[PDB]
Amino acid sequence: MTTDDLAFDQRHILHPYTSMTSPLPVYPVVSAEGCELILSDGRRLVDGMSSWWAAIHGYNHPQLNAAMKSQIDAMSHVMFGGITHAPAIELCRKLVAMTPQPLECVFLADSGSVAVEVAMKMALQYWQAKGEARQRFLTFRNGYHGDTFGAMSVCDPDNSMHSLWKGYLPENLFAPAPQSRMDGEWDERDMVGFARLMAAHRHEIAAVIIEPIVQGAGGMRMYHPEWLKRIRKICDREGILLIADEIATGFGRTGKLFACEHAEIAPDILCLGKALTGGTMTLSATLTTREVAETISNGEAGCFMHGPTFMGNPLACAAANASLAILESGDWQQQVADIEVQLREQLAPARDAEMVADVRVLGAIGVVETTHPVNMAALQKFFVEQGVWIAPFGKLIYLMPPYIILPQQLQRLTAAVNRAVQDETFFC
Amino acid sequence: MTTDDLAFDQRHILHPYTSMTSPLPVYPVVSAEGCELILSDGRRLVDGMSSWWAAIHGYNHPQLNAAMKSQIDAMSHVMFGGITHAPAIELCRKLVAMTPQPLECVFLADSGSVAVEVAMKMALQYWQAKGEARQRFLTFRNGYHGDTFGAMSVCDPDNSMHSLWKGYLPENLFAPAPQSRMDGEWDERDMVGFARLMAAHRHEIAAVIIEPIVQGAGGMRMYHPEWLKRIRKICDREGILLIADEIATGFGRTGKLFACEHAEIAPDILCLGKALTGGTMTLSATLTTREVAETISNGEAGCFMHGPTFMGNPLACAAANASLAILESGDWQQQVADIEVQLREQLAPARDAEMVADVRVLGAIGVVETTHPVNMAALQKFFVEQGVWIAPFGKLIYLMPPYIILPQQLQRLTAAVNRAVQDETFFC
Ligand SMILES: *Cc1c(COP(=O)(O)O)cnc(C)c1O
Numbered sequence: 024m025t026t027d028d029l030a031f032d033q034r035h036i037l038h039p040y041t042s043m044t045s046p047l048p049v050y051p052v053v054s055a056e057g058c059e060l061i062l063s064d065g066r067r068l069v070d071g072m073s074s075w076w077a078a079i080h081g082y083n084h085p086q087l088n089a090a091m092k093s094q095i096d097a098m099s100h101v102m103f104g105g106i107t108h109a110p111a112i113e114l115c116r117k118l119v120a121m122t123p124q125p126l127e128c129v130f131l132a133d134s135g136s137v138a139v140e141v142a143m144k145m146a147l148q149y150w151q152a153k154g155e156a157r158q159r160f161l162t163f164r165n166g167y168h169g170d171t172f173g174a175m176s177v178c179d180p181d182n183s184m185h186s187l188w189k190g191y192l193p194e195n196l197f198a199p200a201p202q203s204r205m206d207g208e209w210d211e212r213d214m215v216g217f218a219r220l221m222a223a224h225r226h227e228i229a230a231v232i233i234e235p236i237v238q239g240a241g242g243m244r245m246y247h248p249e250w251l252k253r254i255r256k257i258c259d260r261e262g263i264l265l266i267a268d269e270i271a272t273g274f275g276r277t278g279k280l281f282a283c284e285h286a287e288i289a290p291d292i293l294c295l296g297k298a299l300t301g302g303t304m305t306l307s308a309t310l311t312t313r314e315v316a317e318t319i320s321n322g323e324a325g326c327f328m329h330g331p332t333f334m335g336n337p338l339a340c341a342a343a344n345a346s347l348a349i350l351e352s353g354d355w356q357q358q359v360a361d362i363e364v365q366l367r368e369q370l371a372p373a374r375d376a377e378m379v380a381d382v383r384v385l386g387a388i389g390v391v392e393t394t395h396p397v398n399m400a401a402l403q404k405f406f407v408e409q410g411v412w413i414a415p416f417g418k419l420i421y422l423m424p425p426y427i428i429l430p431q432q433l434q435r436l437t438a439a440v441n442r443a444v445q446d447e448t449f450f451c
Numbered sequence: 452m453t454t455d456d457l458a459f460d461q462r463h464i465l466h467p468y469t470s471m472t473s474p475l476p477v478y479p480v481v482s483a484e485g486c487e488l489i490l491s492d493g494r495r496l497v498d499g500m501s502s503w504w505a506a507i508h509g510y511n512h513p514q515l516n517a518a519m520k521s522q523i524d525a526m527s528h529v530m531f532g533g534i535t536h537a538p539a540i541e542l543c544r545k546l547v548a549m550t551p552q553p554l555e556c557v558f559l560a561d562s563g564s565v566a567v568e569v570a571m572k573m574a575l576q577y578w579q580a581k582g583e584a585r586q587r588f589l590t591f592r593n594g595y596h597g598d599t600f601g602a603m604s605v606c607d608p609d610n611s612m613h614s615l616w617k618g619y620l621p622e623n624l625f626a627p628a629p630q631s632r633m634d635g636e637w638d639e640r641d642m643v644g645f646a647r648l649m650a651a652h653r654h655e656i657a658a659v660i661i662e663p664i665v666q667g668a669g670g671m672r673m674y675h676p677e678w679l680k681r682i683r684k685i686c687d688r689e690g691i692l693l694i695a696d697e698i699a700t701g702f703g704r705t706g707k708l709f710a711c712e713h714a715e716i717a718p719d720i721l722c723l724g725k726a727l728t729g730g731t732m733t734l735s736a737t738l739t740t741r742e743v744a745e746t747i748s749n750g751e752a753g754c755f756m757h758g759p760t761f762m763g764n765p766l767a768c769a770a771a772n773a774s775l776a777i778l779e780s781g782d783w784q785q786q787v788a789d790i791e792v793q794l795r796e797q798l799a800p801a802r803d804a805e806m807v808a809d810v811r812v813l814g815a816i817g818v819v820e821t822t823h824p825v826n827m828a829a830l831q832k833f834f835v836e837q838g839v840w841i842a843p844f845g846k847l848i849y850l851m852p853p854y855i856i857l858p859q860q861l862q863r864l865t866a867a868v869n870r871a872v873q874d875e876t877f878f879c
């Protein structure tokens with residue numbers, strides 16, 4: 024990789040949420056292996072991010088690799104209209120089996136945002152079919168559900184700058200962000216906001232949508248499981264659908280197979296993505312109940328009106344099947360538990376740094392919230408120099424590493440974060 | 452695939468736009484090679500659909516395969532935030548190079564619908580940065596832009612059943628579907644409807660969005676290039692962005708590399724999907740002008756507000772690079788031209804058939820519109836018994852074969868269509 028390449032990237036290639044006129048450096052990656060990324064210049068970095076949650080088995084994994092190659096030899100893709108195939112059936116078998124009982128109807132899609140759009144459309148078509156006028160969504164503040172219009176409409180209005188689409192995006196209902204902590208005590212006073220909204224709008228709410236336990240992109244918040252119990256009961260009582268968006272929490276990340284398990288509840292609709300394929304390629308799934316799938320099909324439309332071109336892509340399905348096969352071994356449980364203990368122990372010291380607001384950990388997620396925002400270019404460079412890849416945002420320096428990360432490798436990530444927060448150099 | 456597997460699929464697996472209560476037959480495909488799909492019982496089907504436009508090089512292509520397997524050895528995926536990599540760079544060089552000059556900034560995304568969503572958000576943010584109150588889209592009737600909420604808002608209100616979502620979708624402006632055929636003379640009376648809208652709302656329109664030349668999912672309609680020439684001019688005059696959605700028309704399909712060429716015009720925003728990866732896996736691209744990309748960034752939000760987790764996916768990018776490399780050889784041009792001749796010649800006779808409402812052909816697209824809807828289950832079955840894979844819908848029996856289809860294979864397709872439309876058997 025040459026510098027002319029880098030210049031082409033800078034002037035012609037957009038990257039996620041970053042300016043084009045005023046870019047910030049980017050690092051060339053040539054390959055990746057185990058828990059390491061490899062830059063063009065030969066520098067090896069311990070990945071603390073799993074490429075944004077997804078790469079839970081790390082990189083160049085032999086089982087994922089083998090699964091993908093063998094599928095390519097059968098067929099990379101065939102359309103799913105009027106056709107079915109083994110990778111899709113196997114995957115749906117696994118997804119149905121590993122999730123709560125009521126969740127038994129699978130809609131495969133390409134991306135997490137699309138999975139959410141699917142969930143939202145199911146909710147909408149569901150009520151239309153029952154002849155009830157329900158078009159509104161009730162969601163938590165500090166939530167994040169994707170970047171497409173529908174998903175944007177249920178993301179934190181401040182966190183996502185809704186003043187940009189003010190007038191274009193429907194106005195949903197935003198209850199306060201859960202205050203009670205996964206770590207601490209429950210407080211009944213936390214429920215009043217949501218109760219008020221639900222009481223004042225029960226008749227127009229199609230669905231409640233939330234990220235179970237962890238609100239990821241909107242603040243890496245970790246809230247008390249009683250919230251989900253409560254929400255599930257309120258939805259049951261009112262006859263309203265519950266959508267759990269586990270695109271981030273799914274597949275072991277919080278120490279349980281799905282974060283819903285922390286409350287022992289089942290949503291009516293479940294959105295999955297990111298780690299689904301083990302971070303090899305994009306795939307998503309939206310699962311729902313029989314009651315929802317059948318109601319939709321028996322109404323005016325006569326079907327659920329969605330179908331991405333690449334729905335059920337065999338290759339992505341093979342990768343997912345292989346990712347899930349690793350998880351079937353149950354090994355992830357102790358791997359995540361050990362990562363939890365190690366994050367708690369090693370991030371603790373950060374609590375005494377001047378720049379640190381909070382330190383929270385759940386499963387293989389460890390977060391250091393800062394008092395001031397990070398200086399991106401600056402902190403990212405520091406992290407690279409330490410031989411680690413960490414992608415901080417706002418006031419959040421966090422770790423979500425692969426489950427197979429070696430205690431030594433994790434020790435490196437933790438040392439770098441501690442060292443990053445010891446003065447204001449990398450802040451503002 | 453056991454019968455139990457197929458039982459599981461019917462009961463638990465949602466397919467595109469179909470009922471979960473009154474499910475129609477699906478066919479179990481184990482692999483694919485060349486232009487053929489292979490079922491579980493060993494039977495081979497000539498593929499007339501390109502797995503919905505995308506597999507322009509057929510299946511199990513040696514080149515595509517090796518490029519995919521090679522990327523897998525380096526890294527199937529890594530995150531795109533603060534990181535760049537060879538496949539994305541190479542892919543973006545080609546897209547910029549192969550498209551009109553003004554289009555030099557690429558936003559890579561996961562799927563078509565998302566690419567459209569991206570295009571729509573650019574337009575809104577563009578006008579946001581210029582402090583202009585523009586949130587309406589102007590599009591054509593019979594248009595299709597994807598299944599996500601934003602994309603649905605510019606899809607045909609009828610074809611897409613807007614009644615279902617009345618109240619959730621922003622209400623855009625819909626001008627009459629292009630009357631003048633790509634096969635015929637131009638009637639300036641065709642412009643009234645559009646002009647009437649463009650006037651009364653020129654103050655409100657953020658962008659004009661249309662599929663160039665071929666309105667695909669909305670009716671496989673083929674209209675005269677003059678519409679594009681005129682639309683561009685009107686957009687230039689009012690200073691309105693033009694979004695050309697070429698997710699279906701891109702990469703050779705209509706006889707030109709890009710359908711926009713048929714009118715030698717250039718969009719402000721261009722959406723690419725489907726055939727981009729040679730139908731191996733999902734990937735999309737939205738290209739735009741420096742002016743748009745800079746405006747947005749130098750805007751108040753500071754960047755373009757969008758970023759899919761799997762943005763720039765190396766594996767997909769390398770499949771796309773291999774696919775474009777095949778197009779670089781230039782063969783598609785005559786491969787497509789020949790297909791167009793064969794389609795024109797061999798579908799001609801369907802015009803003597805009683806169930807046929809119209810026959811139209813453009814590039815590697817052949818359409819036999821019928822007077823009555825098809826019996827999907829019965830027709831598909833007939834086609835499979837004739838050794839071909841054709842996916843009809845509504846009143847359209849159409850073909851979009853791989854560019855590498857042999858003439859005798861193309862012949863079994865067109866014969867199958869001709870035989871299907873002779874009477875009422877497979878209809879209503
Ligand atoms: C990442 C994420 C999404 C969206 O996934 P994309 O694949 O980026 O569209 C949606 N919801 C949550 C909670 C996520 O974390």
Ligand SMILES: *Cc1c(COP(=O)(O)O)cnc(C)c1O
Nearest residue numbers: 331332562563564596597698699
């Ligand atoms: C198929 C198509 C889309 C949608 O692409 P998906 O990948 O199915 O989301 C958008 N626009 C046009 C013209 C299309 O043909």
Ligand code: NA
Nearest residue numbers: 119122123126
């Ligand atoms: Na289940």
Ligand code: NA
Nearest residue numbers: 547550551554
């Ligand atoms: Na160009």
